Amino acid sequence: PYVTKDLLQAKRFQAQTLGTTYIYDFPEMFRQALFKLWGSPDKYPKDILTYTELVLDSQGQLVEMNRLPGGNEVGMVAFKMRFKTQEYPEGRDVIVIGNDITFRIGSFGPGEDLLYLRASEMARAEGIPKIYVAANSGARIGMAEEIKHMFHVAWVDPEDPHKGFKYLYLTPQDYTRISSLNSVHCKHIEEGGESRYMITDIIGKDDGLGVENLRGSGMIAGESSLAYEEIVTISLVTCRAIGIGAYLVRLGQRVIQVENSHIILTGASALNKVLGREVYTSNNQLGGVQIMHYNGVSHITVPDDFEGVYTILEWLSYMPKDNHSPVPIITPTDPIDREIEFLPSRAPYDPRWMLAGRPHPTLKGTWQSGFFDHGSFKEIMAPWAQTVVTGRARLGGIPVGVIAVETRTVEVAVPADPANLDSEAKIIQQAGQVWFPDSAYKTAQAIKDFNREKLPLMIFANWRGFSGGMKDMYDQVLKFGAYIVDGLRQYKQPILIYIPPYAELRGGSWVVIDATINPLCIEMYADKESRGGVLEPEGTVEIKFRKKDLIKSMRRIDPAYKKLMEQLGEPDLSDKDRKDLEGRLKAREDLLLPIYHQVAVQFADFHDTPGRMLEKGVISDILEWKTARTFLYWRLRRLLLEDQVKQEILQASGELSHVHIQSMLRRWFVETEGAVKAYLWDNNQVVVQWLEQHWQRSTIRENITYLKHDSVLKTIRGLVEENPEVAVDCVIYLSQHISPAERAQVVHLL
Amino acid sequence: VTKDLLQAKRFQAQTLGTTYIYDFPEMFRQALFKLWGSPDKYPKDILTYTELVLDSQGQLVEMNRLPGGNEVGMVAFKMRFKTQEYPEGRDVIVIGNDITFRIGSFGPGEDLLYLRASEMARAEGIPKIYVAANSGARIGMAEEIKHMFHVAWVDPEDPHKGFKYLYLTPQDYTRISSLNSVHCKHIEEGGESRYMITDIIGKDDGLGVENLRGSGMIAGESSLAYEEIVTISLVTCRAIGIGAYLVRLGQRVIQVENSHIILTGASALNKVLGREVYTSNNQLGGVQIMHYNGVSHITVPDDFEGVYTILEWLSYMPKDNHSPVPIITPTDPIDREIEFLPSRAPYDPRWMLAGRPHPTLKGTWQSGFFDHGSFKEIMAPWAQTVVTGRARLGGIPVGVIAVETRTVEVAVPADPANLDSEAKIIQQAGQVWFPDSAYKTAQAIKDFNREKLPLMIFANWRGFSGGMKDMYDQVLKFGAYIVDGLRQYKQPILIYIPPYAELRGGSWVVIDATINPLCIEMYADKESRGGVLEPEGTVEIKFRKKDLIKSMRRIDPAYKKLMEQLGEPDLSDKDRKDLEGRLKAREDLLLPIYHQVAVQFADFHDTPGRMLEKGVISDILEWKTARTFLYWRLRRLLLEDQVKQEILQASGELSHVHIQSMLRRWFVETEGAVKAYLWDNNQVVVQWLEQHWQATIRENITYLKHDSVLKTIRGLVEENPEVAVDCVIYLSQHISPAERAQVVHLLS
Ligand SMILES: O=C(c1c2ccccc2cc2ccccc12)N1CCC(N2CCC[C@@H](C(=O)N3CCOCC3)C2)CC1
Ligand SMILES: O=C(c1c2ccccc2cc2ccccc12)N1CCC(N2CCC[C@@H](C(=O)N3CCOCC3)C2)CC1
């Protein structure tokens, strides 16, 4: 019963004027975004986008159907979508939930809450991404309207109402109507020898008025917490997100906020009324882009709903079809065999340029290539914690999370507090190559988030340590520093940490990143022109090469300081000669000392080389930036494949040792390829070529076959050994579905 | 050795304002004595301990030998001490730096001991106590080269023209080449051959980047330890760098007063910053900062009282991570009433928890909710809007979260490094979550969940602090963390809205039962309140001026009489304008009065009555009886979860629908269907569980094992018909000769 002229036109106008998109016009928007991503009419596949509406049936379960648009029994709609993308030409599935803002200002009733619940639950059922379009007014609020205009007031003094009232009540005739409906609890009182029904509680005939709504928020709040742990969650904020709306967005983490919009818990109109003054001017003042985009809650901003949708697909580009598929590697137009044109220097630079490249400064149309595949690097949480840069990219078409360090002094404009006229906007300096509380957090968030995308991670390490002065310590830098340790510990994909040219990893920043946090996943590489150590060289000298040592160094190298020999060696004691040289030696001491300190600092530095890193087995290999792209490509591409064989199958069958499994994989290489060819196992490329002989009579799967079969041998032997009572009744179970021919085989054996 | 080693090293420790590492065991004994009260109340062998020691193959071997002689800057003991809740003993692994070894620095060997000792703590599921007195990762240089290198100057007789490179003579290089101490390229400077230092490696191990590695290792270990076992930490002198990160990664931390937790010291920062900004290390990481920011859970005046807190904290916690929370027979009887009465006006939450000195009495105590003396607070000075700690209800240990109702004043300190910033005083409203109350709340929830404790939230929140500064300050992030924390909770969570307490809006949402329906039970006091908005706000939206007017038309005789007069329109404009004026007069008079009646009408929706009808709460409760009621419900819920989660779940893997129905169905079998209603009685149920299980007891549980094991094997054969006929003929080994004829006819 939904009419196009009547229902459709008006509802879209109603979303149009709210500055949002009517919920049933999003599927079509997704169709249009994909068409752009494919770049033409002549490059477009058959069914770019298939969808189906998820609809709650009479017993609160979802049922796929594709009725016409509109006509939804709750103010939320869900769709199961499939769309042919470049990473998945034969399709990838996805679930989109979103408020019908036209329906009761997008309020959250128990019915709405339920659909979102089942939609989310299903998404997790199939391990596929959950897109949520936030356009709402938070939990629904209501009263007992029925009873609102029945109740009478027992005044303390009917002449003077400034003197208040005793209670509220209903007369017997009033109560008789509402009696059986159990709308109202009230104690039968007999004031003035007259019968009244003194209200004690008000329930309401109608459902979805109060506390039930709050529970129903927490329910979908909870669900949304779990889903962030299990599947991909992306969220689009278009008109507004309030309270339960806001919390849903945030629990999903990844958030695309449209500019007009806001993300609030309590609106300015409200806050003004509680506080008592005109404190806040707008809802955009509280939770608009210029707050959330700048504090990390919103990962990225978009100018309109369409660029939202487009980013959603743009994000899903890097991420696996589901939470049991691998990351979509695509054939790159950007060559792996090339060099990186952009070189990072002792001159401070935007780390974006080394990642994504930049326009060639000394040329017209030329581009300076960065480390990643041209055009692939897409940043998130940019204006927050600008001391670190986080985002995703592609290396030879392999998707990957990126973590880079800013090397220019950053400034941050913390805004003045509107509930405090004794405050103003402050600007705060932030040093390059330093973890602050905000960078520490952002860095840990990126790690937490990317891990959930099953993405591999590339950290371009260049940190001198954590900020450690009072304010930053007070501001809990230590807590967030420790989450970097928590985050990498729990990572389950390859992490490649790489110190670039003229970059450095010093002290506590090395500690929270070191390979031994996650031996199975982390590999640490230093550039030929990088540095690393506990302290900086100046500091090492300050502690471990002090003045006493410096004068000794003089006593050795500097020939002039053989005044010392002249001093002590020959026995001659005169106030003249003995006191003369005594001051004259000090003379030279003073002249040489600052320059020997400069030597001392160089001596310190020569300890901090990648030369020594490799020697003390802390980094895997020493690289060269020009040819680092291609090295890390084949290494990344191998590690992904080794990881597939091991976890996916080998561990999903043998349940055997990780040290053991590495061996058993190499054991197979040497076994079929020969001992004479064994050395090549250390060559990344050749190993990838050999791996596809098995993965893509499979030398490797024929082995996994034998493992998983022999594994179920020991599994049934353990139970029957543990539980000899079952064995007898068990043989008859296996006999029901054995084999009529082999049934006699057994039937005669024992 | 005794005088030389012991007296010296003790003086050496003394002068650094801390205890010698080997003297700690005796403090634990001395602490234990104070914990037991009188010497008559002592137990047999109060403390037993062995030292853990690395062997030739880097593995911990227990031994008992003379103190001193630790061959690495780190020491650790395995201790068994007898406590009140564990009279026959409980185990822990103590581990700490030797500040007297090498400024208490961390080298690879020091790291390895920590690694192995923590690994062991996790292996055995037992707590890991960590004593911090250190100086972060060890730093060193290739001394050998230090004493051998030469400088190739730009000009010999004026070294201020600088130097080209450093180098070794070919002679000197032939002493070193075997040792791999230094890498260098050959070079000729005016026909003299020189070996130009390119890299310096060092003969002696443990100089630089390898120490960071070894730090990163025990950080990773520490990070995991917090997930598996209880982890406590005491900073006695200073924890530096890696030492600061271990202390933090283990979360629960006791800081002695003049000590500090830092990364880079005040000295270093001053040089780097360019002026003498910081006067002390305490200024960066002393009690005054770390206690006020959540890093330090509690502060102590000395080591002894520090060791005591360790015992005092462990007293709430289970002996290992596969044992249940230690209930002890209470002295404060379970059946009394709570004498403190939460007021409509603000009060100190702690009073309703711990009780207070009777204001109108001589030496009387006003009882609180929990056992007397039993509530101990953590993170007191930080995020004071919320209160976190541990208490006991009838001897049942339990994590505690309570809300502040008075106004809070946080005295944020001036950053010496910023010439502009002077100190400030921030007011923080009560009954409100802030970026810190939220953080503290979820931080308490995660800490306590790892102790395997039950949680008790005496909820009293009007909502999250909205508004710009708090929203800019990421309140929305930490608010979400409360959801995650209760979602992941694995013990019982009892939420009680006490008398004159309220639970509103987003504060309801992030604390609801549906977040974790297997653990969270919600209760509202008879005089408590709850709902979407405050009544003042409900009225602002759903009971507006036009509507207040409609009420007056209905229910005000004066007002109603005025209308009646204008209802006979046959009068002069004088009378028409007058009565119009009068009626406006009357509605202006009444609007503030009717606003009050409208808020009260709104308020009658927010009642615990309604919560119960709409099923958001499990029961309405009365503060006097609150203590006794919850005690039995907690005790029941614990036993139920004990049988269920431990015993019952080990057998089958079915849903919790059976586990509940089945547990009850068993009760109704052994106790009759007439006596079925008592399943709703907590005490009868507690009595029942003990008298049967602890003292279909494990006959029904046994029967679960067969149908489960068979089920398991079925799926494997369903999955792999490959295995079928090899297993069937492997199983001709297992079946009996008499059982053979049993099956041979049964199958043929
Ligand atoms: O190596 C030294 C060091 C010196 C470094 C440079 C010049 C002089 C130094 C003198 C030192 C003296 C003693 C120990 C270490 C020293 N460090 C001292 C400073 C250490 N911090 C690393 C982290 C970033 C910096 C830092 O914490 N800041 C920078 C931002 O504001 C907060 C304070 C410096 C790095 C280690
Ligand atoms: O119900 C109302 C509400 C009013 C409450 C009390 C007095 C006047 C109110 C007026 C309202 C008007 C419109 C909607 C809701 C209103 N609330 C709106 C504000 C909500 N916040 C709860 C959290 C604490 C408060 C808050 O955010 N503050 C607390 C003090 O610090 C600054 C920020 C307000 C609580 C719910």
DSSP readout, B377-413?
EESTTSSTTEEEEEEEETTEEEEEEEE--S-EEE-PP
Q: Order across the sheet with B90-97: list the strands.
A: B60-63, B47-54, B74-81, B90-97, B128-132, B231-235, B252-256, B298-300
Token digits of residue A341: 């044109």
* Residue that finishes a domain, picked among B205, B224, B240: B205
Contacts with A424 (C-beta within 8 Å, 6 or more apart), sequence order? A416
What stretches of B61-174 show up as alpha helix (H) in DSSP?
108-124, 143-146, 170-174
* Residue that finishes a domain, picked among A262, A288, A323: A323
Report the amino acid identity of residue B245: Y
B377 in the same domain as B461? yes
CB of B437 closer than 6 A to ligand 2?
A: no
B666 in the same domain as B689? yes
Number of domains in chain B: 3
Let me know: does B55 contact B61? Beta carbons within 8 Å: yes
Among candidate residues B378, B387, B385, B431, the one with its CA nearest the CA of residue B409: B385
Q: What is the distance between the alpha carbons of residues A632 and A636, in angstroms, rounded to a whole number?
A: 6
SS3 A531: strand
Residue with tokens 């003077």: A160
A580 in the same domain as A520? yes
Q: With an 8 Å Cβ cutoff, are A200 and B150 in contact?
A: no
Token digits of residue A468: 């450690």
Pairing of the two strands B298-300 and B365-366:
unpaired
Nearest to B743 among A532, A731, A745 (CB): A731
Among candidate residues A730, A704, A706, A705, the one with its CA nearest the CA of residue A717: A730
Residue with tokens 């009777």: B358
| Partners of A405 in the β-ladder | A388
DSSP readout, B427-439?
EE-SSEE-HHHHH
A192 in the same domain as A103? no
What stretches of A490-533 show up as alpha helix (H) in DSSP?
507-511
Let me know: does B129 contact B232? Beta carbons within 8 Å: yes
Report the nearest-CA residue for atom 27 of ligand 1.
A467
CA of A349 to the centre of ligand 1 (A): 22
Distances (CA, A) of A408 to A293, A500, A503, A656, B43: 21, 16, 13, 48, 64
Three-class HEC string of A50-88: EEEEEEECCCCCEEEECCCCCCCCCCEEEEEEEECCCCC
How big is the A-B interface in CB pairs under 8 Å? 506
Q: After which residues does chain B show a gap where C to N exceeds 2.5 Å?
A: 695
Distances (CA, A) of B527 to A230, A263, B675: 41, 34, 33
Technique used: X-ray
Residue with tokens 């404060």: B332
The C-alpha angle B428, B431, B433, rounded to 5 degrees, equals 70
DSSP letter assigned to residue A108: B
SS3 A47: coil
Let me know: does B96 contact B200? Beta carbons within 8 Å: no
First to last CA, chain B: 84
Token digits of residue A641: 């494949």
| Partners of B76 in the β-ladder | B52, B95
Let me know: does A544 contact A515? Beta carbons within 8 Å: no
Residue with tokens 């893509």: A696
Task: Give percent helix, percent strand, percent coil of chain A, each to the nearest 5.
Answer: 45, 20, 35
Contacts with A714 (C-beta within 8 Å, 6 or more apart), sequence order? none
A599 in the same domain as A472? yes
Token digits of residue A280: 């806040």
CA of A270 to the centre of ligand 2 (A): 6
Q: What is the distance between the alpha carbons of residues A457 and A494, in angstroms, rounded to a whole number?
A: 6
Q: What is the distance between the alpha carbons of residues B414 and B427, in angstroms, rounded to a whole number?
A: 17
Pairing of the two strands A165-170 and A130-134:
unpaired
CB of B465 closer than 6 A to ligand 2?
A: yes
Residues on chain B touching A148 (C-beta within 8 angstroms): 543, 547, 601
Nearest to A508 among B197, B199, B241 (CB): B241
Token digits of residue A748: 């005669």
Among candidate residues B397, B324, B319, the one with its CA nearest the CA of residue B80: B319
Minimal CA separation from B17 to chain A, in Å: 23
A182 in the Ramachandran plot: left (φ > 0), alpha (ψ -120 to 50) or beta? left
Nearest to A726 among B285, B512, B706 (CB): B706
Q: Within 10 Å of residue A560's Cβ, how many Cβ atoms?
A: 16
Three-class HEC string of B359-380: CCCCCCEECCCCCCCCCEEECC
Nearest to A153 among B284, B516, B555 (CB): B555
Q: Which ligand is nearest to the CA of B427?
A: 2
CATH number for the domain that contains residue B189: 2.40.460.10
Let me know: does B22 contact B15? Beta carbons within 8 Å: no
Ligand 1 atom closest to residue A537's alpha carbon, by position in its atom list:
1
Distances (CA, A) of A81 to A34, A93, A221, A227, A228: 13, 6, 23, 18, 19
Minimal CA separation from B621 to chain A, in Å: 16
Q: Per residue in A224-261, is it b (16+ CB within 10 Å) or e — as a string?
A: bbbbbeebbbbbbbbbbbbbbbbbbbbbbbbbbbbebb
Q: After which residues does chain A show a gap where C to N exceeds 2.5 Å?
A: 696
Pairing of the two strands A410-414 and A426-430:
antiparallel
A64 in the same domain as A149? no
Minimal CA separation from A34 to chain B, in Å: 32
A167 in the same domain as A68? no
Q: How many CA atoms lie within 13 A of A316 on its CB side?
A: 33
Q: How many CA atoms lie within 13 A of B443 on its CB side?
A: 27
Q: What resolution in Å is listed for this PDB structure?
A: 3.2
Q: What is the distance between the alpha carbons of residues A466 and A461, in angstroms, rounded to a whole number?
A: 13
Distances (CA, A) of A257 to A18, A237, A284: 15, 5, 12
Do the annotations mark residue B544 as ligand-binding? yes
Among candidate residues B298, B313, B305, B488, the one with its CA nearest the CA of residue B399: B313
Q: What is the distance between the alpha carbons of residues B442 and B455, in angstroms, rounded to a whole number?
A: 12
Let me know: does B495 contact B508? Beta carbons within 8 Å: no
CATH number for the domain that contains residue B512: 3.90.226.10
Pairing of the two strands B520-525 and B619-621:
parallel
Let me know: does B487 contact A226? Beta carbons within 8 Å: yes
Token digits of residue A332: 């790159």
Among candidate residues B27, B126, B25, B18, the one with its CA nearest the CA of residue B76: B25
Q: What is the distance between the alpha carbons of residues A127 and A130, in angstroms, rounded to a whole number?
A: 9
Q: Rounded to the nearest 5°, which phi and psi values hold at B195?
A: -105, 105
Pairing of the two strands A367-368 and A358-359:
antiparallel
CB of B429 closer than 6 A to ligand 2?
A: yes
Residues on chain B touching A515 (C-beta within 8 angstroms): 213, 216
Q: With an 8 Å Cβ cutoff, are B512 and A141 in contact?
A: no
Minimal CA separation from A469 to chain B, in Å: 6
The C-alpha angle A504, A505, A506, rounded to 5 degrees, equals 110
Residue with tokens 């949002």: A20
The full length of chain A comes to 750
SS3 A41: coil
Q: What is the distance between the alpha carbons of residues A496 and A515, in angstroms, rounded to a whole number?
A: 9
B54 in the same domain as B105? yes
CB of B468 closer than 6 A to ligand 2?
A: no
Q: What is the distance between the alpha carbons of residues B442 and B37, in angstroms, rounded to a whole number?
A: 35
Let me know: does B102 contact B240? Beta carbons within 8 Å: no
CA of A274 to the centre of ligand 2 (A): 5
Let me know: does A107 contact A75? Beta carbons within 8 Å: yes
Nearest to A618 among B210, B471, B530 (CB): B210
Q: Within 10 Å of residue B373's Cβ, how many Cβ atoms?
A: 12
Residues on chain B touching A729 (C-beta within 8 angstroms): 706, 710
Residues on chain B touching A476 (C-beta within 8 angstroms): 293-295
Q: With an 8 Å Cβ cutoff, are B241 and A153 in contact?
A: no
Q: Within 10 Å of residue A576's Cβ, how many Cβ atoms?
A: 7
Token digits of residue B737: 């000769």
Among candidate residues B263, B443, B440, B282, the one with its CA nearest the CA of residue A481: B263
Let me know: does B221 contact A522? Beta carbons within 8 Å: no
Report the residue of chain B nearest A604, measured CA to CA: B141
DSSP readout, B42-83?
--TT-EEEEEEEE-TTS-EEEE---SS--SSSEEEEEEEE--
Dihedral (CA of B75, B76, B81, B85) sign: positive
Which of A211, A269, A271, A274 most suits a substitution to test ligand 2, by most atoms within 8 Å of the C-beta?
A274
Do the annotations mark residue A452 as ligand-binding? no
Contacts with B590 (C-beta within 8 Å, 6 or more apart), sequence order? A161, B548, B552, B556, B559
What stretches of B149-249 show up as alpha helix (H) in DSSP?
170-174, 209-228, 242-249
Token digits of residue A20: 């949002």
Ligand 2 atom closest to residue B429's alpha carbon, by position in its atom list:
30
Among candidate residues B1, B128, B108, the one with its CA nearest the CA of residue B52: B128
The full length of chain B comes to 748
CB of A187 closer than 6 A to ligand 2?
A: no
Q: With an 8 Å Cβ cutoff, are B216 and A720 in contact?
A: no
Q: Which ligand is nearest to the CA of A605?
A: 1
- Measured N-to-C along each axis, helices B623-641 and B682-689 cross at an angle, to the nearest 10 degrees, of 30
Among candidate residues A723, A649, A653, the one with its CA nearest the CA of residue B713: A723
Residues on chain A touching B597 (C-beta within 8 angstroms): 153, 165, 168
The C-alpha angle A516, A461, A647, rounded to 5 degrees, equals 45
Q: Rounded to the nearest 5°, which phi and psi values hold at B437?
A: -65, -45
Q: How many CA atoms lie within 13 A of B309 on its CB side?
A: 25
Among candidate residues A108, A138, A321, A118, the one with its CA nearest the CA of residue A227: A118
- Which parts of B190-313 are beta strand (E)? 192-200, 231-235, 238-240, 252-256, 260-262, 298-300
Ligand 2 atom closest to residue A271's alpha carbon, by position in its atom list:
19
Let me know: does A504 contact A609? Beta carbons within 8 Å: no
Contacts with A8 (C-beta within 8 Å, 6 or more apart), sequence order? A2, A69, A70
Q: Give residues (CB < 6 A) around ligand 1.
A: A 431, 434, 464-465, 467-469, 507, 535-536, 538-539, 542-543; B 264, 268-269, 271-272
Ligand 1 atom closest to residue B263's alpha carbon, by position in its atom list:
27
* Residue that finishes a domain, picked among B175, B205, B235: B205
Q: Within 10 Å of residue A219's Cβ, how many Cβ atoms?
A: 22
Let me know: does A305 contact A450? Beta carbons within 8 Å: no
Q: What is the distance between the alpha carbons of residues B493 and A503, in angstroms, rounded to a whole number?
A: 49
The C-alpha angle A606, A610, A612, rounded to 5 degrees, equals 65
CB of B599 closer than 6 A to ligand 2?
A: no
Minimal CA separation from A671 to chain B, in Å: 26
B415 in the same domain as B328? yes
Residue with tokens 């005088």: B3
Token digits of residue B338: 């709570």
Minimal CA separation from B632 to chain A, in Å: 26
Q: With an 8 Å Cβ cutoff, are B480 and A264 in contact?
A: no
| Partners of A235 in the β-ladder | A132, A255
Contacts with B138 (C-beta within 8 Å, 6 or more apart), sequence order? A534, B102, B105, B106, B107, B110, B206, B207, B211
Q: Find the radius of gyration of the CA atoms of chain B.
A: 35
Q: Within 10 Å of residue B460's Cβ, how many Cβ atoms?
A: 26
Let me know: does A234 contact A131? Beta carbons within 8 Å: yes
| Partners of B496 in the β-ladder | B458, B523
Q: What is the distance between the alpha carbons of residues B283 and B414, in angstroms, rounded to a whole number?
A: 11
Let me know: does B232 contact B310? Beta carbons within 8 Å: yes
CA of B522 to the centre of ligand 1 (A): 52
Report the amino acid identity of residue B423: A
B92 in the same domain as B173? no
Which of A265, A531, A549 has the most B C-beta neighbours within 10 Å, making it the best mutation to test the interface with B?
A: A265
B82 in the same domain as B1? yes
DSSP readout, A208-255?
SSSHHHHHHHHHHHHHHHHHHHHS-EEEEESS-EETHHHHHHHHH-EE
Token digits of residue A384: 């927050």
A66: containing domain: 1-141+208-323
- Which parts of B657-745 are beta strand (E)? none
A36 in the same domain as A129? yes
Nearest to A517 among B216, B263, B716 (CB): B216
Q: With an 8 Å Cβ cutoff, are A713 and B731 in contact?
A: no
Minimal CA separation from B149 to chain A, in Å: 8
Q: With an 8 Å Cβ cutoff, are B532 and A247 in contact?
A: no
Token digits of residue A343: 């070189």
CB of B327 closer than 6 A to ligand 2?
A: no
Do the annotations mark residue A546 as ligand-binding? yes
Q: What is the distance between the alpha carbons of residues A441 and A388, in angstroms, rounded to a whole number?
A: 10
